[PDB]
Design a binder for these strands. Structure first.
Ligand SMILES: Nc1ncnc2c1ncn2[C@@H]1O[C@H](COP(=O)(O)OP(=O)(O)O)[C@@H](O)[C@H]1O
Ligand code: BEF
Ligand SMILES: [Mg+2]
Ligand SMILES: [Mg+2]
Ligand SMILES: [Mn+2]
Lengths: 474, 468, 84, 467, 467
DNA sequence: AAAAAAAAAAAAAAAAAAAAAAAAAAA
DNA sequence: TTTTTTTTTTTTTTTTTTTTTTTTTTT
């Protein structure tokens, strides 16, 4: 049911345009999924699109990324369809960073069918002396309404983007992507402020859009004010488009997720969704919409230590068992992915497969170089298929002493006695006499020479070393 | 738990000499970015850090070069000081200082270090101890929690001294037995070698003299035989007596009176020295074998670290992994003029092991050196989580640059928890900086430039609302 | 020293721009702008637990600033024993 | 003028973002483009005809793109009517866009002064998709990028047909192709211009081309005579007044850059943007000087052509040269002060360059010290003064002769070691030296032993002295 | 002189089977090589250097150059490199130097087989020295220049900033005067050998003198006792024959003549040692003077290039200075060399080595190589820059790009100039006349078998392999 | 025409000598 | 405090040993 007093908002977040645009397999994933998102916005006749940040993957998007974003925004967000909602807010303080401080659909030279309200994510936060972002370029072109950007480092005062369609009224609070520790410092110094309308304050929805880390520094979710009714959350790619309320916060938390698989995290394997928000006065109804152009991502984690039945650390042929088990797991995951690819034709054929093998009981990883060579044209991440990792005494003196004793018993010393050169070397190392070896050698030489001289032994080599052996034995 | 907080550079290389030119740089956590033109002074900061920590000048540089040149200064002498403030392992605040002087004398130039100061805070009061550049090492080496070898090679590796893992066998072995803290056993081994060569030279000289002493011995024995025969003839003739007297006088020369004794003594000393030489060879071989066993046994768990690091970081289906491997020389002896050191970084190209040296690329060498340094930092720099990467993205392509940024981000995440990790990055690549700063660790970065007088200056800049 | 010139059929007060501003509700009417004075800094009731966390982290910040002051005055310390 | 007059503002090389990171030199091209757009708005021009190189970099930075977008939105968009038609197939003229129509014809864009531009070589299309910065501008809807080359093999130029009242204009265009390629295409007869088959002589043709003029020369002979006004680019010497060569029936216009990109002696002339007024086949080009373009004064000096003050071997000429340069840069720093009055928009710090050419043996002075004097008076302190210019056997023989005549030879004969070394060098005889050393000892030793010398230490020396 | 084609087989990562023969065609005036790390970009320059001069990459002994016989899992890896090019006159020559790396026991034998020279299409087998000289004559530059200026390795690229002895070897190979240093080594070795012989002979001298003294004492006893016997008793006859036996002994028979001859030899070798010391000092001074005279000319080029290129205000200019040791002698254990690149910070000259930055060092090395190419590479206009922007900052990268573009413009006036660049920088490729010159570049990657491939890519895909 | 034994040249890399500062007497 | 002699490190030139190349000398 869509009355004249309903707010259909297509809440997307973390589109991450241009992500891996140089890849031959995943080059056009983000653009296609943004095309699908805009198609959903156009087909559902939404009032406006509410992007949660990180619309671009890079701080300075490439020419292809910006051109594709402009093409899609002009194709879908520009039209002759009348806008149904008001803006009773001081537009020179919400969008008043550009030299055109008014909402894009109200410009006398632009015809906007679907207004776009967005915040900037930490991948595309403003930089430089002029403090410009990619969303600034989009807003200057006239396609997006960049709102919620902070102006002063010392303190932040956000101004709601007041909207009203019929009876219903929404206060669209928005915060940019301040660095997590800096924003934490603002939240503990009471240097953050939320300006609510002065009167009728209890008749606004107070929708808040924030792009920050959550339970993952981390901006905890209890620092946020208690008057909010919905909190869209970005910088979190595991979809939770379903609104969730904790024990005591009096507001709902929606996590739209991402439009693409950026990292290979375990929480990133969840099915990506885009929201379809509806507001009628005070009530909310978020309807999840699956995206059929998002590449699949299946992962498995195995710890070889916790399977003593098959994985025997002392088995000389255990490496081939590891390789066979990993091959079977990858084949099972690929078959499962193929079984789910017959529902729709839009999902890319090559899925994302990740297999983290934790070896800790003295296992040797196999040839990951050649194992991944058996899926060159069957997976979308040929290089990153298997991840090997381990989750997180010896003294040279004993070794040298042991070697010295072993040598003395495996060859026969000729002049120097047993356990004398070992202690000489030990003294040189520890006490730093720096003359112990020479002193010992000279002392033994002079002692044996004096004995040989006083013993009255004729000058012939055989008798000389015979008496030398006699002295060593005695 | 050890962090370098702030620095004061004065008179070092291109920095100014007047106290108005004293530049101060405060290191942030967990990432510190240094940018600037060529010759600005970015590397000079790490050189100052290394000199403060360990007292060693940059490679190829003596005391005369590290400090500002008096000729360019148009001054008779130049006095430099570097002040570092930090926390030791327990978190106590310690400030150290090292002074310096270069005097321009005639054509050459003379260098000399003045006494440095150690300052702490005990019971709320301030103390100072003027020390002599040998207590300002040991003491602050113990304070930082890491040894001099790791501080020189792993943490504050000079830009020129980088890629030291891919160096010659003897150089790599020296780096790794300073790192493993076994230098004195190699000192004992070399003392054994030197004493063996000395005794061998003595044996050669003894043989040379023994030839002449045998000639003397036989001639004297013949003289004695003729003396006895002539006495027997006479006792059974004035000229006969005169001949007897003359032959006794021939026995009276110094090389004949003492003939048997010197030959006997020299025989005994040469034979005993030869036997001592054999036993010294045996002991030298044993000690060398033990040292190369210990080396291999302590590179066991670093190779194990290096393998995972290289597999995670390197983006190429070329090398399975790399590891450091050493092998003792079987036919080694203390009398050998040149020894052989089989201490090489090995690349696992497939199922066969090759030698990385002379067989890798510039980017592969840079990545391997970075991975080896990071593994050594994980193994040894546990109490002092600092590492200074001087242009780590040199000769690295796009994929390896991105993977190195990801690996450094993972290291930052895994070491900033309950510990302080300070990654000092001096780069000319804005992309590497953006990749590291996507986690929002960078709020202020240092831009080193020069004033009109061409003296280095350090000024803090802001990423937001200020130029980059 | 010339160019190839070949002919094709390319043809396929007064205005020729196609634009009519689609009206938005509130266009040309009195602008009922809300902002400036009627924007107050609302509060957060009691939130003791939240107050506890904020105060504890503020104490952590105060301790860190105390250490930083000691660091600053240690660095500014002039070396009295610098004669050598 | 009247209802049947085309008014076109021709600014060609804006070069936005040039020296953006520079402190004094930054924020100059943006202001010059602001002035150009102000002039277009004030003159009520029909449309703006850019000549390429609108951006300095191939991928313009965020500041450059944002400033260009804000200026285009402020000046080129509004409620002012459009008075001309587009009779050509908009799918071919502007069809490398998902929106193949003119920007003012779009049902969601209100454009007062449409912009028709070609791409220069500094911002030519690069990448897999073959995109340029003008592509981003056209996607935003402020620029009508026309004249893009689709096929590498051949060039077909289809004009953007225009018509205001009775007058007709054929707007040919061509982005900057690599000059050697484009030259090879022109030689191979692979460049064609498609003219309307209706009212063939009733169209005023004008070509907008961004190429070199002085293999890389693409001269004027390589343009047909059916056109009548060839606007040009990749040329910063402001020749905005049209010229007609006797051999070429088509006019040539060279609006030039709006900024001083290089310190060549071709940017020291004042820059103008041209107000054009076609009215049928009658054209009237009227220049408009730029009041915000930084001044550029420069002189070329050749030290070898003044044999009256610059003595080649004078021990103190290196100070007379510095004095002459100091006096020169000072008349220009003053001629700049005297010429800056009235023009409140002129930047205070001018551009001064001096090229010093020496070939008689002069030694350049410390360019750092000379540039340390004028640091807050010239806009480019780093680049003030340019300085430029347009055997073993015999030596060892001479040195050996000098050594022989200098010190007393003990035993070796005169001119023996020199010939030994010469034999070793050429004949590569490796024993040419040892042999001689040995043969001299062997000889004189013999000589000595025949005379059964007393072997006294100093008496043998006298025997060798006899030699 | 220019290079056209190259065919690599079995070198480093390039494949061994005949199906993996990669072919690369060099463009003019700019050729770009891009690819991942450890792909084969630098291996191409190594192959060019090896086919030009026969010298392996620094640190390579020829067994680490051929494809490891183990990674190929073979017992022999036959490696062939071909290079089709034009000599100074303009004729086509191709050389096909080959080698094998046989695997036996735990070692790895290496050897080079006979290459061939093709010229109509006359192919003849040749030995390494003959192909080396032939290609040196054909290209028009010396082997030292080919090794150090044109095709220097990525690791041996900062050679002008090396130690004094190494720099002197590089520069006297460059100046073609190595035979004189070979003569200096011969003179030093002769003097050292004669000194050692003199030491041993003087050690023997005392013994000989003592033997002579004993012989004289025996002879005086003989004379006195013979006089006593002639005056006159039986014992005076007995001691006579014993004395005759003593004189009969060889030790005291001819001791006088042997001692005299040894002393004569001793004095002779002493004066010859002195003479050779004087000659060695004179020849060393002559060589240093020749170096200074032949290097002052290129000092001007180095100065001007540094002044144009180096954007900083630290160093006024750089040059290279050689100073002979005043107190040198052939008997010295260690010599001291004073070859040094010198930087002038204001008015005082300093040693650049050990006193410069990484970017300063790489820029100085580039300037030295470009100056030596201006002086010596007139006949062969090729220079291969393996990552020229390795440590340069943004301003110096831009200035180096401008200088290289100016060199391309100037040196293309009558002869072909090639500037083969291996790089990972998109901005440098852009600024190096990306639109003007480069249309097709080269990507070096690896197939599924980890054998390097060389593929020609259009400039549209340039950004995929660079950052 | 081919083998192989031996002598010569190259160079990578370990060894060592000269310089200079540090330390240790030493008055 | 300063002088003077001995130690130690560095670093840059020297020496060595193995390998390849080449020469020769035979078959
Ligand atoms: N003794 C000295 N006196 C004066 N200037 C010096 C001295 N030693 C080095 N320099 C100069 O000081 C600068 C040192 O900067 P450096 O830290 O090496 O640069 P970067 O940070 O670019 O790597 C260089 O210009 C160098 O030539
Ligand atoms: F690894 Be290559 F040198 F870029
Ligand atoms: Mg540096
Ligand atoms: Mg390389
Ligand atoms: Mn141009």
């Amino acid at each position: 049911l869509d009355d004249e007093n309903t707010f259909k908002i297509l809440v997307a977040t973390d589109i991450h345009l241009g992500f891996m645009e140089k890849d031959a397999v995943r080059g056009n994933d983000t653009f296609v999924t943004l095309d699908e998102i805009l198609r959903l916005a156009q087909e559902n006749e939404v009032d406006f699109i509410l992007l949660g940040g990180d619309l671009f993957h890079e701080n300075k998007p490439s020419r292809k990324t910006l051109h594709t974003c402009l093409e899609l925004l002009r194709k879908y967000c520009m039209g002759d369809r009348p806008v149904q909602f008001e803006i009773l807010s001081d537009q020179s303080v919400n969008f008043g960073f550009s030299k055109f401080p008014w909402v894009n659909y109200q410009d006398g030279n632009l015809n906007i069918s679907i207004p776009v309200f967005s915040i900037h994510g930490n991948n595309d936060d403003p930089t430089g002396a002029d403090a410009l972002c990619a969303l600034d370029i989009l807003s200057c072109a006239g396609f997006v309404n960049h709102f919620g950007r902070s102006m002063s480092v010392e303190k932040i005062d956000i101004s709601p983007v007041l909207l009203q369609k019929g009876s219903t009224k929404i206060a669209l609070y928005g915060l940019g992507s301040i660095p997590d520790e800096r924003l934490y410092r603002m939240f503990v110094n009471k240097k953050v402020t939320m300006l609510r309308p002065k009167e009728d304050e209890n008749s606004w929805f107070n929708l808040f859009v924030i792009h920050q880390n959550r339970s993952k520094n981390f901006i905890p979710e209890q620092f946020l004010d208690d008057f909010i009714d919905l909190v869209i959350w970005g910088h979190e790619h595991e979809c939770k488009i379903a609104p969730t309320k904790n024990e005591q916060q009096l507001f709902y938390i929606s996590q739209p997720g991402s439009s693409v698989v950026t990292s290979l995290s375990p929480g990133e394997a969840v099915k990506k969704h885009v929201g379809l928000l509806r507001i009628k006065g005070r009530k909310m109804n978020m309807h999840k919409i699956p995206l059929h152009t998002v590449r699949q991502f299946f992962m498995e984690d195995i710890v070889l230590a916790n399977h003593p039945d098959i994985f025997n650390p002392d088995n000389p042929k255990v490496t081939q068992a590891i390789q066979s088990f990993c091959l079977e797991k990858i084949e099972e995951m690929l078959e499962n992915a193929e079984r789910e690819r017959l529902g729709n034709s839009h999902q890319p054929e090559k899925p994302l497969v990740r297999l983290r093998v934790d070896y800790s009981g003295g296992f040797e990883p196999f040839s990951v170089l050649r194992f991944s060579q058996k899926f060159v044209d069957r997976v979308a991440n040929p290089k990153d298929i298997i991840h090997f990792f381990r989750h997180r005494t010896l003294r040279v003196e004993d070794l040298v002493k042991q070697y010295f004793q072993t040598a003395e018993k495996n060859v026969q010393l000729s002049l120097l006695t047993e356990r004398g050169m070992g202690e000489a070397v030990q003294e040189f190392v520890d006490k730093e006499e720096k003359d112990a070896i020479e002193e010992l050698v000279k002392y033994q030489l002079e002692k044996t020479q004096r004995f040989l001289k006083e013993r009255h032994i004729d000058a012939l080599e055989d008798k000389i070393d015979e008496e030398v052996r006699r002295f060593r034995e005695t | 738990m050890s962090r370098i907080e702030k620095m004061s550079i004065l008179g070092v290389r291109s920095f100014g000499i007047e106290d108005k030119d004293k530049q101060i740089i405060t290191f942030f956590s967990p990432l510190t970015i240094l940018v600037g033109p060529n010759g600005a002074g970015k590397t000079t900061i790490i050189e100052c850090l290394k000199y403060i920590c360990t007292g060693d000048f940059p490679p190829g540089t003596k005391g005369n070069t590290f400090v500002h040149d008096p000729k360019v200064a148009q001054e008779t002498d130049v006095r430099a000081q570097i002040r570092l403030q930090f926390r030791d392992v327990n978190g106590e605040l310690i400030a150290v200082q090292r002074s310096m002087v270069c005097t321009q004398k005639s054509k050459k130039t003379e260098f000399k270090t003045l006494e440095g100061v150690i300052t702490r805070t005990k019971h709320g009061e301030k103390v100072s101890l003027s020390s002599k550049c040998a207590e300002i090492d040991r003491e602050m080496i113990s304070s930082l929690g890491v040894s001099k070898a790791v501080l020189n090679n792993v943490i504050f590796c000079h830009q020129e001294d980088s890629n030291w893992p891919l160096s010659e066998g003897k150089a790599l072995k020296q780096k790794f037995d300073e790192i493993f803290s076994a230098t004195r056993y190699i000192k004992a081994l070399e003392t054994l070698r030197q004493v063996r060569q000395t005794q061998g030279q003595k044996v050669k000289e003894y043989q040379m003299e023994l030839k002449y002493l045998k000639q003397y011995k036989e001639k004297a024995c013949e003289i004695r035989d003729q003396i006895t025969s002539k006495e027997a003839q006479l006792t059974s003739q004035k000229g006969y007596e005169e001949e007897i007297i003359h032959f006794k006088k021939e026995l009276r020369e110094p090389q004949f009176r003492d003939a048997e004794e010197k030959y006997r003594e020299m025989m005994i000393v040469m034979r005993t020295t030869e036997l001592v030489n054999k036993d010294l060879d045996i002991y030298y071989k044993t000690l060398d074998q033990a040292i190369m066993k210990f080396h291999s046994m302590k590179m066991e768990e670093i190779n194990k670290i290096i393998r995972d690091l290289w597999r995670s970081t390197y983006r190429g289906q070329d090398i399975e992994y790399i590891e450091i491997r050493s092998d003792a020389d079987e036919n080694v002896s203390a009398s050998d003029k040149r020894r052989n050191y089989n201490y090489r970084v090995v690349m696992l190209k497939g199922d066969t092991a090759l030698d990385m040296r002379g067989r890798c690329s510039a980017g592969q060498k840079v990545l391997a050196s970075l991975i080896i340094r990071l593994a050594l930092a994980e193994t040894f720099c546990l109490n002092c989580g600092i590492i200074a990467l001087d242009e780590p993205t040199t000769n690295l392509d796009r994929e390896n640059i991105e993977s190195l940024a990801h690996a450094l981000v993972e290291i930052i995440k895994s070491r900033s928890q309950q510990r302080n990790f300070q990654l000092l990055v001096i780069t000319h690549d804005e992309d590497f900086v953006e990749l590291l700063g996507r986690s929002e660790y960078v709020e202020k970065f240092y831009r080193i430039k020069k004033n009109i007088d061409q003296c280095s200056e350090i000024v803090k800049c802001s990423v937001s609302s200020l130029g980059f | 020293k010339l160019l190839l010139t070949e002919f094709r059929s390319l043809v396929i007060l007064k205005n020729f721009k196609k634009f009519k501003k689609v009206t938005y509700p509130g266009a040309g009417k009195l602008p009922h702008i809300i902002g400036g004075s009627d924007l107050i800094a609302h509060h957060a009731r009691k939130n003791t637990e939240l107050e506890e966390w904020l105060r504890q982290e503020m104490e952590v910040q105060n301790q860190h600033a105390k250490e930083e002051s000691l660091a600053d005055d240690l660095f500014r310390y002039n070396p009295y024993l610098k004669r050598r």
